[PDB]
């Protein structure tokens with residue numbers, strides 16, 4: 001939907017172009033952003049360098065320091081559940097809950113498939 | 124013959140609210156189903172309360188809690204001053220139909 005109207009891919013205008021390119025739907029706004037969306041799970045944002053330090057969201061602060069500035073709100077270090085819940089936004093008439101922590105893990109990489117592939121020659 | 128037989132449930136405190144801004148208590152029927160707590164598909168009324176203060180009612184607390192028969196109970200830290208919640212729990216009412 002572009003400004004409330006359905007459009008047929010690709011839709012192109014000055015600065016903006018949206019396409020069914022490849023396996024995804026890609027929205028590129030020139031000098032602003034690149035948004036890839038496979039349509040089922042993945043979704044990837046490329047941002048200009050000029051938005052360094054001026055962004056905030058699940059994608060982080062874009063200041064370049066990974067381990068010190070994302071999860072420290074009012075000097076208190078917080079957790080992925082907390083960080084993902086701070087960046088929340090309900091609908092006008094919606095009260096979505098907060099998902100509760102999942103219990104401990106199991107399985108692990110028994111057959112080594114993740115270690116066989118990820119650590120394999122391909123990468 | 125068939126007559127409705129109905130009764131209350133027990134108390135369900137499946138979470139301990141977390142200090143901070145995004146914290147609080149989120150006691151939802153879907154979470155109750157996931158955690159293994161028995162959730163009746165059909166109900167008539169449910170009752171919420173604070174687990175640590177089992178006398179003074181919800182409105183006497185004055186905190187912002189939404190507690191409804193279709194969803195459950197939710198208290199968010201950021202909506203209250205101080206930005207915190209109490210440790211709440213709730214119970215539900217289950218009614219079936221038994222032959223006379």
Ligand SMILES: *[C@@H]1O[C@H](CO)[C@@H](O)[C@H](O)[C@H]1NC(C)=O
Nearest residue numbers: 052053054061062063064069
């Ligand atoms: C990044 O943002 C922090 C937040 O206040 C600021 O203190 C710092 O000077 C900024 N640095 C750059 C390089 O933008």
Ligand SMILES: [Ca+2]
Nearest residue numbers: 061065069070
């Ligand atoms: Ca950072």
Ligand SMILES: [Ca+2]
Nearest residue numbers: 136137138211
């Ligand atoms: Ca609780």
